Symmetry: D2
Subunit: 349 residues, 4 copies
């Protein structure tokens, strides 16, 4: 013998069914799982102090947007928010349920430097993860998220073998623990845009990473039918003075995925990773003009769904409606991009 | 740096174009590349002595079948045949060209036991391979084939890690050498049916092997767009008294491929591996009733295309026509199976 | 680039110096790091309820044994004990320091089943490990311990690839984190004796595991000069009716280590793993009759140093002296075994 | 199950016994296995045309040196020479036997670029290797040699993962095939000195390579007791204007070996790799001043044993005696260096 025991068919069915619901046509994920420190930065942008009350107000503003569920299949939550009530006393999860949005929960405990690397990062959080997953399921979560980070630096040989090995190991362990507890795992191996590297460099690294990730997922007996991928798009580095064309980004991104991602995976939900709201919509749209694809190409956007929303809000309560309006504009934009039907707003081997 | 140099776009284009031609809808591969010893066994079945003249007569009988190219996109040849003339003096390759059938060449040098394994096999042939590929291209070949073999034996822990590692390493090296010489590599990791194991055991092993193979292909910078896979179907062991249903075989085979094979690969061309001619047609057909698929599911059949052909021939020259007729019946059967339109002849996680 | 940054020479020096102190000739480790649940079992053997007071009494009994430091270079502590005072109010660490015994700290958070394995175990504890190490160093600890566990079961293919991969990954991460915080890591990949397998089976598995472990240590930039190995001895399974001869155990154990352990490692400190006190002494002694060795072969014994000590104590305070006497008898026995000079008490390829 | 079958104890004994004979104290290997093209270069240095007669004359000059066997335990031969007779009609092997020098045979078929690498090399020769080994054993050979080559180029990320993986795979396959045929395999993963890299860079790469090599040897069931390592010394790059001190080279070389080479290996026989004759002697000597070591540190020198010999010969027959004299001077020099008793001639973590 020596292979993986059979997964529970009942569990597997649930996972696969929820994965497909999350990767529904014309829909994608709202990533609102900013940790206390990450949300601080977001609020700093608009001059708002990071109070529990303000966070509760803002997350309520997002999830109580009437009709949001037309374009948003799931919303990733930070632990605080999962157990939080809106200023009016409605549980955040109940707001989600009312729009038919599936709650998801971020479950990693952040980044820690790998000893004797040049500030390359391991993702922590496996300790107690299985128990946390059980509690989170009971609280209403049906999918999870775990963020690993890799840097490109040709001069420094980044990402190093150790980085890739660690990222893949952590993601596989996390994914398998999640599925054991009936949670669909979002696998997020984010290759940062930092640097002045070319898009073809990003393509090469993305391919190497994903090849490593999916081998590890297989090694750890992860059910691809009941999982999702949240990868970077393939782009120039953020220091490159010329943002690649949307066609170019679409071509290399799709290429990189098709070269590495087995098609049993139901959905690829891109992180926006610093892209403007409009680039993130156009790039996705351009990919889905190239369909049909073996898996759903959609979105799991944080900044690219909230940037204008935050700036419309400004911390002013009376700006709630206008803020919710702009969130809808962008949710609709990206839902349409999923179908390759977004008009726009305000082979290489 | 440290990544693979860019492939020649001109070479890549050729490979990708020829791979897609081979995996054309409604068409598949005739595997007529039996070595001298393997063809002996085939001829023994029908009481024919293995002479060069008889081999030339038989291969001519196959390739000169009028209208064969309607269902056969490519034909795998043994070296002898590639440089051989029909009894009438027509080069074998010219017969192929006349039907628009792409010539392919088997390039491995057979099997050798891995030291200190229980008769597990390495595939030999890398030495001189690159030079052979150049000559073969010039002779008209545009794709190649390399057969690796794995056994299932739960009691003996077969296939062992060493077996899988060796198979994958050899296949990747061979594939990359082929593409460097403008030949599309057929990657054949055959898991033998030997034993009384269940279909679910075959599924598990097939998944492990293919995961290992495609990781290795990626490591060796193989262009999936310009390659083909020739895997076993997922079936019960040959000693199991109950042949699995065609639906069951179709389901687990497709599942195993979708769980491991990135969709940039243009085609999966199944070996028939001992299956009757009709099972091989029905099983393929059942898979393509489940389409559309991310890659072409087709055939690269040896025995399942020739079994009745040989028995109709019997070594009798005057039986040439009848023999060619039956080959057409089966070529048509499998071409139709490719499209899921074969009528028949005479979710589990 | 892409390799590991240079370790701090000052840190490295400290680690290497302390590793050599721990693996001092004629000395070894007292493993007194039983968790709350493990010590319960030990106390159950002698009918003593697991109170904090009784644990403090017992650990004091051990560490306050006059002259213990002659044979004991280091003592592994559970967190509780590291921050604990004897019944008389003397800090446990001060008892150790008074005998010149180096304090060590167990830092793993125990075992958790790997999903979809047959109850194979991952070791948890990386989360927060680096911070814990800093605190532990400040409390006086200079080395750490992390226990991974593997099972042999030929019928079930245990240990599986996933088990070995996980064990090695966890050990390497833990080791590197430890060294970053100036703590010598004891690497403990314990292959359980459970089962009726032969000693030659144990030898094969031990070799495979250690090969995997030391490759991983190298991958993670662990300094072998500043680390220690705590492996199982190579023995028959615990269900085998015939305990192997001490010569046999010595031969295969040494063989397995020399086949896999690079000699920059200063010390191999065996776990006793269920062996009687006398077998553990005789087996070690027999190994060091075969010296000189490329590394120190010594002991890190829990049960094999305390078994008679506990039974002499019986929870009776007045039995303290007698209990301390027997601990000395065994500490001396194993110190002498380290030098191959123990008299006894009451080539295969 | 799933592990390696037991090696033949009779075969293993022979291999281990011959490995120890080759790595005898005060002795080392004469590497006279230059291929036709490599010997051309050597002869070009002294203005001698590469005729079969001249090659036979020169190899006779080497092996017929009276008393050579005092310092030379084995001599590596090219196939031609193994089946060659001296100008006087004495078989080359009989000259060796007369001095009690063990014949060895180079068995690789040279280097071939790995596709899509920057001219990184695979070693070819596995095809037919097992059969060649049988013939070579019968001809008198008792050990074999296989040369793999790696380059250091930080800017190009050399050696790449593919290079290391290939080198290790080829060496392991070759080693296991050799032992199956009763031949001790010399494992030669030569890291070229090309470049201006530092000695610490060489140390890091050497460690990575050897870690990979010995993991692969273990995976392929190679008997370390019956094998030898032929590694580069750890030195500055050949373009560095400052040759490292002999102490420095000795320290880092020993360090790199002790960090990666399990001590069951009987001998490390260094290649001279472009070093002057005197540096090669002094560097080895300096290492053996640091003894005792867990394995024999000795030599397998080609150029560093023949450089002056060739220049003394000049192709002039009458210079045979003088040429043989200088070969003895150097054989004695390196034999003494093996024991750390060579006078000279004309901790960092």
């Amino acid at each position: 013998s020596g292979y993986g025991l059979p997964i529970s068919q009942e569990v597997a069915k649930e996972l696969a069914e929820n994965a497909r619901k999350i990767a529904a046509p014309g829909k994608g994920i709202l990533a609102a799982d900013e940790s206390t420190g990450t949300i601080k930065k977001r609020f700093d942008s608009i001059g708002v102090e990071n109070t529990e009350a303000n966070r509760a107000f803002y997350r309520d503003l997002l999830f109580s947007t009437k009709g949001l569920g037309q374009y948003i299949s799931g919303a990733i939550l930070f632990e605080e928010t999962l157990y939080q009530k809106s200023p009016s006393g409605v549980p955040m999860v109940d707001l989600l349920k009312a729009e038919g949005i599936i709650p998801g929960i971020k479950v990693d405990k952040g980044l820690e430097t790998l000893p004797l690397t040049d500030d390359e990062k391991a993702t922590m959080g496996l300790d107690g993860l299985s128990e946390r997953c059980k509690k989170y399921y009971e609280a209403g979560a049906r999918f999870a998220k775990w963020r690993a980070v890799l840097s490109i630096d040709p001069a420094k040989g980044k990402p190093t073998n150790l980085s890739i090995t660690e990222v893949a190991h952590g993601l596989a362990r996390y994914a398998a623990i999640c599925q054991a507890n009936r949670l669909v795992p979002i696998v997020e191996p984010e290759i940062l845009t930092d640097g002045s590297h070319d898009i073809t460099v990003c393509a090469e690294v993305t391919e190497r990473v994903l090849a490593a990730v999916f081998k590890a997922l297989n090694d750890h007996h992860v059910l691809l039918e009941g999982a999702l991928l949240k990868p970077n798009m393939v782009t120039h580095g953020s220091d490159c003075p010329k943002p690649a064309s949307h066609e170019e980004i679409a071509f290399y991104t799709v290429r990189s995925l098709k070269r590495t991602v087995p098609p049993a995976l139901p959905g690829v939900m891109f992180l926006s990773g610093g892209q403007s709201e409009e680039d993130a919509s156009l790039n996705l749209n351009e990919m889905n003009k190239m369909g049909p694809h073996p898996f759903q190409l959609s979105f799991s956007y944080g900044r690219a769904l909230q940037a204008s929303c935050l700036k419309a809000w400004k911390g002013v309560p009376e700006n709630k409606a206008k803020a919710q309006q702009v969130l809808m504009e962008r949710a609709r934009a990206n839902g349409e991009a999923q179908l390759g039907k977004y008009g726009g707003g305000a082979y290489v081997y």
